[PDB]
Amino acid sequence: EVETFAFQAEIAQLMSLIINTFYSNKEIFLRELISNSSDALDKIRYESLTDPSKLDSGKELHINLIPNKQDRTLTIVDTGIGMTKADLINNLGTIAKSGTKAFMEALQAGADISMIGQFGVGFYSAYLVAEKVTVITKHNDDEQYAWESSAGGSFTVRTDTGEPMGRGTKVILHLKEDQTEYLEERRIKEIVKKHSQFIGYPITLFVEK
Ligand SMILES: CN(C)Cc1cc(O)ccc1Br
């Protein structure tokens, strides 16, 4: 069972601005996704402070970076609070309608695309380097769902029968053919050190055979 939804107009517009605007500093995507994972890890740590059993689905709070050269995917895994189905449909838990409005007004007033995270829609920077994005997520109060979009004005949501995650969120970036540099160990490591060096969670860069 696969449901297909239209993006709100303002979100589709933000997505095509990100895809079409000439802008060379594409590496900020990794900082924005990592920062979103860190925010979701803060959220489940804070709930665990008064209710320990919110960690029965995973005591470990971490972020993993997993490049796969055969599939041409970069996967960002976190064991944060995760997302309910309604969250996924509602622009992946963001206020994307009003953040895009403020983001685009800023762009006309001195801002550049690298400031997208200040307006809450940093996730969509994923499309600076990905032609398709898949978000697997599991929240304590809901089942495991798969969100998927290749832009073009729509996204799908389905129940994910893949590997149980326990709790957290997985962003699979199907990279564009000319963005494979973000699969290389030394290039990911440079970006993490440049932009994410004070994230309060361990970031493990997986290696490949
Ligand atoms: C924005 N990237 C990292 C996906 C994501 C992770 C979360 O932990 C929560 C929401 C989203 Br979308």
**Which DSSP string do the residues of 127-178 spell out, in sequence order?**
GGTEEEEEEEEE-TTS--EEEEE-STTEEEEEE--SS--SSEEEEEEEE-TT
Nearest-angstrom CA–CA distance, 140 and 57: 8
**Is 176 annotated among the ligand-binding residues?**
no
The reply to whether ligand 1 has any atom less than 6 angstroms from the CB of 123 is yes
What spacing in Å lies between the alpha carbon of 64 and ligand 1's midpoint?
13
The topology (CATH level 3) of 2-205 is Heat Shock Protein 90 (3.30.565)
Which of 134, 137, 149 best tests ligand 1's pocket when mutated (most atoms within 8 Å of CB)?
137
What spacing in Å lies between the alpha carbon of 165 and ligand 1's midpoint?
15
The reply to whether ligand 1 has any atom less than 6 angstroms from the CB of 40 is yes
28-50 helix and 185-195 helix, angle to the nearest 10 degrees: 60
Alpha helical stretches, state H, the chain: 9-20, 28-50, 85-89, 96-107, 185-195
Q: Are the CB atoms for 88 and 135 separated by under 8 Å? A: yes
Nearest-angstrom CA–CA distance, 61 and 51: 16
What technique determined this structure? Answer: X-ray
DSSP letter, residue 39: H
Tokens 């440079």 correspond to 190
Q: Are the CB atoms for 149 and 131 separated by under 8 Å? A: no
Tokens 């973000």 correspond to 182
What is the residue type of 46? Y
Nearest-angstrom CA–CA distance, 59 and 89: 27
Q: Are the CB atoms for 10 and 91 separated by under 8 Å? A: no
Q: Is 8 helix (H, G, I), strand (E, B) or coil?
A: coil
Q: Are the CB atoms for 111 and 143 separated by under 8 Å? A: no
Using DSSP, how many helices (H) and how many strands (E) does the chain show? Answer: 5, 8
What spacing in Å lies between the alpha carbon of 106 and ligand 1's midpoint?
23
**Is 91 annotated among the ligand-binding residues?**
no
DSSP letter, residue 144: -
**Is 123 annotated among the ligand-binding residues?**
yes
DSSP letter, residue 7: P
What spacing in Å lies between the alpha carbon of 77 and ligand 1's midpoint?
9
DSSP H or E run through 140: none
